[PDB]
Write an enzyme that holds these catalytic residues in place. Structure first.
Site, PDB file in Angstrom:
ATOM      1  N   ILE A   1       2.023  -5.650   9.782  1.00  0.00           N
ATOM      2  CA  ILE A   1       3.404  -5.977  10.238  1.00  0.00           C
ATOM      3  C   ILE A   1       4.084  -6.857   9.191  1.00  0.00           C
ATOM      4  CG2 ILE A   1       4.824  -6.909  12.117  1.00  0.00           C
ATOM      5  CD1 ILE A   1       1.171  -6.127  12.863  1.00  0.00           C
ATOM      6  N   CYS A   2       5.269  -6.421   8.781  1.00  0.00           N
ATOM      7  CA  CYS A   2       6.205  -7.206   7.956  1.00  0.00           C
ATOM      8  C   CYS A   2       7.111  -8.010   8.890  1.00  0.00           C
ATOM      9  CB  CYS A   2       6.982  -6.288   7.034  1.00  0.00           C
ATOM     10  SG  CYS A   2       8.103  -7.199   5.954  1.00  0.00           S
ATOM     11  N   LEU A   3       6.753  -9.281   9.081  1.00  0.00           N
ATOM     12  CA  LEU A   3       7.554 -10.276   9.838  1.00  0.00           C
ATOM     13  C   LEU A   3       7.279 -11.684   9.291  1.00  0.00           C
ATOM     14  CD1 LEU A   3       9.538 -10.499  12.212  1.00  0.00           C
ATOM     15  CD2 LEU A   3       7.543 -10.805  13.711  1.00  0.00           C
TER      16      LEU A   3
END
Ligand SMILES: [Zn+2]
Ligand SMILES: [Zn+2]
Lengths: 153, 126, 476, 191
Positions: A85-87
């Site tokens: 996840i890109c966060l």
């Protein structure tokens, strides 16, 4: 030991008042590790999908963000094939936004909001991001078929 | 015993200022013929709470880093100079956080930088 | 369509790749879009292949290179790629940007100007290409006509800097000109624009802008940058005082501007001399309206530089005498009171520093103390052991005390360093008049004696000299 | 003498840290390699035995020496930096920040000095646990890119040396992709 006091309250909080559309328990297979399940949001192609996430707490938690990946696969612009996840909340600052003020449940709520509102500005899957941005129906079809194929029983 | 003791305050920088001021102005009215409590009450011009346990039982009066009361003797002591946070912390936990930040800079036994919850200037003196 | 270009690039140059380049003509755009859709290393392979296949000896290739430049420049920002391929694209373009005539690179920089003015530069990572282009124009000794390539760079940068900058991309523009070989006038225009901008920005976006300005200033323009930051922060303080007639924001800003000007003054022993020259009040006899609450904060942070300590302290001292001469002359005299507007006096400003000191100014306080003991030590009484030898010494000394009392209220770690120094001038001298010091000491202790039961040993070790002291001294 | 002084009586001296450092600047600024080695030893034991504030003041002082600099001083300062990182990188790691800002003043430094300087920064960068602070990694890739991206042979070499030296340090599978891409870029620039 700060890890211990944090996991203690949060595990009890996530057993009694977890965020709607979210469950998280101490995993029976991996009792150091935790199993999370995020239920498919209505008015999105991820509806009627429950996606399993593995939640590893790093030793310096809460100074370090939890380690979160989709085990049950998801087709998303800001989630790769490996479930990564890109966060910003999952990275230490100045680049990331992590602080001990936040918890497993606030970041899983942020992930639930990300599934509802994908970010085309920070794509892991640039093919899927272009498709989401320009061709909503194709993305919605593929993401909904992706939900149907892996998050069904 | 009835003689004045060595005395100091923990708490909010904006809360504690007036107490120090009032103590300095009233400390001459210290008198070793009264009791400790009977002198403190009229020196500091206040009454005490008798164990506010029932109402604020689980208000989260913990570190807001490790989320514990009683970290190996340690009590939530260090607070925010802010009306909207007021969040207590521990020495150990708030040092380990602030030591990391790129924002933080250290003077002699002091660390400057941002309250975790509200991102306002908070000071830690070891 | 890509594998053939790899295979034509494998063996030989300017035979097959040129001949394939005169086949399509239509859409390299779609090619690079599907390429970033599949895999970036394939795109790097093609970029090397195309740029070797379109040499700049021939004139057909230059225009393919131009169109792929416009394509990759727009896609690196607007097209959200992965980071590694972004860096490799820009590294590649940066690399092949040498082999050119002047006007193709001039129109590429005109593309940059025309993008950056109106075009929302979606990220701004393409500007890493910008210096390399200007680098080529500095070194292109192929003469132009519109002139040298460096004069085209002059024209372009003047048109860039005179033209409007967006609020979010003044930081990027400045960190980029960090590398361009600039003369004086050029770097003056860069910083003129960057200073113009401060007011239309968040305050929390001033510290890093000032940092990059000053590491850039080392080329030409130091007086300008500092006069600018002084000017801007002085005006903020005045606004804040008239509105009181954002505190903890303004103070936490000023207090990290000062660290940043301090590092640079260690790295540049000249930045300081230009500062001092700019701020010296005693230019001939004249009080300047350059001096301020921030302007002084800065100096009192400078006092911790060994080289400046002296020069700064002695300025302040001399400025403060000067303060008191001015004010005394006014007050004795209505003719001047009719004409002159009541300007704040250095006394009052310092005390306002002292109020503002509370927060985060550990670096300022160690200068205050040096200052105050210099005021008292120099202008303690002597002729009994008159206005002129008395009042601006009395008012100097009595500034001293006010400072150090006020400090002793709020900086609880320079207690035993005030206290221990008072006592240090108390005990041994007993020959110089010390009336003022015990007066100080009385106020100090009185205010909070409970605060000397945090520094107590320093008194009880001064009681051991009570045998050797004259009687008024001891009793008093 | 200085060794046994600061190793036994640190507990006296911990107080009078400030003074030692207003001394140490004064030793390096002169000639006479034995003076300048003595100044080194001040800085070394100063960061070794005191507290963080002193430790922080140490690195800061070294930063001034490199950056403002003349040849001797510079050289000394870099030697000390190497000792400090190999002694206690973890303590040095939180003062990595002023170490990165060195790169803003490479205008002054000679290429040999440059090999050790990029060596220091990269050796600090590739602690396995402070990939969290890859900040410096990205910024160093940036300055490499710009130097390589130059007509001027004088800049080309800096980028080359820095890049190659970094690669050796990270080389004790994504790492291999970086190094290959790095070295391929160097080859293209150098061609
Ligand atoms: Zn707070
Ligand atoms: Zn704690």
């Amino acid at each position: 030991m700060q890890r211990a006091s944090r996991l203690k309250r949060e595990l009890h909080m996530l057993a009694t008042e977890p965020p709607p559309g979210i469950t998280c328990w101490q995993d029976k297979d991996q009792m150091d590790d935790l199993r999370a399940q995020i239920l498919g949001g209505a008015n999105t192609p991820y509806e009627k999908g429950v996606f399993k996430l593995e939640v590893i707490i790093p030793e310096r938690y809460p100074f370090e963000p939890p380690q979160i990946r989709f085990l049950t696969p998801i087709y998303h612009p800001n989630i790769d094939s490996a479930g990564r996840i890109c966060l910003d909340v999952l990275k230490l600052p100045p680049k990331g936004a992590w602080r001990p003020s936040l918890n497993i449940a606030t970041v899983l709520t942020s992930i639930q909001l990300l599934m509802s509102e994908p970010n085309p500005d920070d794509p892991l899957m640039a093919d899927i991001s272009s498709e989401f941005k320009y061709n909503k129906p194709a993305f919605l079809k593929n993401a909904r078929q992706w939900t149907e194929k892996h998050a069904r029983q | 015993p009835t003689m004045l003791p060595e005395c100091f305050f923990l708490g909010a920088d904006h809360v504690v200022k007036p107490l120090g001021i009032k103590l300095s102005r009233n400390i001459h009215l210290w008198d070793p013929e009264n009791s400790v409590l009977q002198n403190l009450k009229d020196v500091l011009e206040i009454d005490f709470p008798a164990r506010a346990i029932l109402e604020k039982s689980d208000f989260t009066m913990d570190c807001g880093i490790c989320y514990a009361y009683q970290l190996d003797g340690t009590i939530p002591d260090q607070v925010c100079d802010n009306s909207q946070c007021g969040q207590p912390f521990h020495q150990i936990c708030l040092y380990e956080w602030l030591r990391g930040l790129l924002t933080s800079r250290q003077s002699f036994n002091i660390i400057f930088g941002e309250c975790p919850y509200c991102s306002k200037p908070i000071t830690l003196k070891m | 369509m890509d594998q053939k270009i790899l295979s034509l690039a494998a063996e030989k140059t300017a035979d097959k790749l040129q001949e394939f380049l005169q086949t399509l003509r239509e859409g390299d755009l779609t090619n690079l879009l599907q390429n970033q859709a599949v895999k970036g290393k394939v795109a790097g392979a093609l970029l090397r292949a195309i740029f070797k296949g379109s040499p700049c000896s021939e004139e057909a290739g230059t225009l393919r290179r131009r169109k792929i430049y416009t394509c990759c420049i727009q896609l690196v920002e607007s097209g959200d790629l992965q980071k590694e391929i972004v860096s490799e694209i820009i590294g590649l373009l940066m690399l092949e940007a040498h082999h050119f005539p002047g006007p193709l690179l001039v129109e590429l920089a005109n593309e940059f100007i025309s993008a950056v003015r109106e075009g929302s530069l979606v990220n701004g990572k393409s500007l890493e290409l910008l210096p390399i282009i200007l680098t080529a124009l500095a070194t292109k000794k192929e003469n132009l006509a519109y002139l040298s390539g460096e004069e085209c760079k002059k024209q372009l940068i003047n048109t860039l800097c005179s033209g409007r900058w967006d609020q979010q991309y003044v930081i990027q523009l400045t960190s980029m000109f960090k590398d361009v070989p600039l003369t004086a006038e050029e770097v003056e225009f860069v910083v003129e624009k960057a200073l113009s901008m401060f007011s239309k920005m968040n305050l929390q976006e001033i510290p890093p802008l000032v940092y990059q300005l000053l590491v850039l200033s080392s080329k030409g323009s130091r007086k300008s940058v500092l006069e600018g930051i002084i000017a801007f922060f002085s005006a903020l303080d005045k606004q804040h005082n008239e509105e009181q007639s954002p505190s903890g924001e303004l103070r936490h800003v000023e207090g990290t501007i000062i660290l940043h000007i301090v590092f640079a003054i260690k790295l540049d022993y000249e930045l300081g001399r230009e500062l001092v020259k700019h701020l010296k009040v005693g230019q001939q006899g004249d009080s300047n309206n350059n001096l301020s609450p921030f302007s002084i904060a800065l100096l009192l942070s400078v006092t911790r530089i060994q080289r400046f300590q002296d020069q700064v302290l002695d300025l302040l001292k001399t400025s403060v005498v000067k303060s008191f001469k001015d004010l005394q002359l006014l007050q004795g005299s209505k003719f001047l009171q009719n004409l002159v507007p009541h300007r704040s006096y250095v006394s009052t400003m310092i005390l306002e520093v002292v109020k503002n000191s509370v927060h985060s100014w550990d670096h300022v306080t160690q200068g205050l103390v040096e200052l105050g003991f210099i005021l008292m030590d120099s202008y303690g009484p002597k002729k009994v052991l008159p206005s002129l030898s008395r009042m601006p010494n009395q008012h100097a000394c009595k500034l001293g005390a006010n400072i150090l009392l006020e400090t002793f209220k709020i900086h609880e770690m320079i207690r035993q360093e005030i206290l221990e120094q008072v006592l240090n001038r108390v005990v041994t001298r007993a020959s110089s008049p010390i009336s003022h010091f015990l007066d100080l000491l009385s106020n100090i202790v009185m205010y909070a004696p409970l605060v000397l039961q945090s520094c107590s040993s320093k008194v009880t070790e001064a009681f051991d000299y009570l045998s050797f002291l004259p009687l008024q001294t001891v009793q008093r | 003498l200085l060794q046994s002084t600061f190793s036994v009586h640190y507990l006296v001296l911990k107080d009078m840290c400030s003074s030692i450092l207003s001394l140490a600047q004064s030793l390096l600024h002169s000639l006479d390699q034995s003076i300048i080695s003595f100044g080194s030893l001040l800085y070394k034991y100063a960061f070794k035995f005191f507290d963080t504030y002193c430790q922080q003041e140490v690195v800061g002082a070294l930063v001034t020496h490199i950056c403002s600099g003349n040849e001797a001083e510079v050289d000394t300062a870099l030697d000390v930096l190497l000792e400090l990182v190999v002694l206690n990188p973890s303590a040095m790691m939180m003062n990595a920040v002023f170490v990165k800002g060195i790169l803003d003043y490479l205008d002054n430094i000679s290429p040999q000095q440059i090999r050790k300087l990029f060596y220091v920064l990269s050796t600090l960068a590739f602690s396995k646990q402070n990939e969290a602070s890859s900040h410096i990694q990205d910024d160093m890739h940036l300055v490499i890119r710009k130097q390589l991206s130059s007509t001027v042979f004088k800049y080309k070499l800096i980028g080359i040396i820095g890049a190659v030296t970094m690669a050796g340090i990270m080389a004790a599978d994504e790492q291999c992709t970086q190094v290959t891409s790095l070295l391929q870029l160097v080859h293209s620039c150098s061609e």
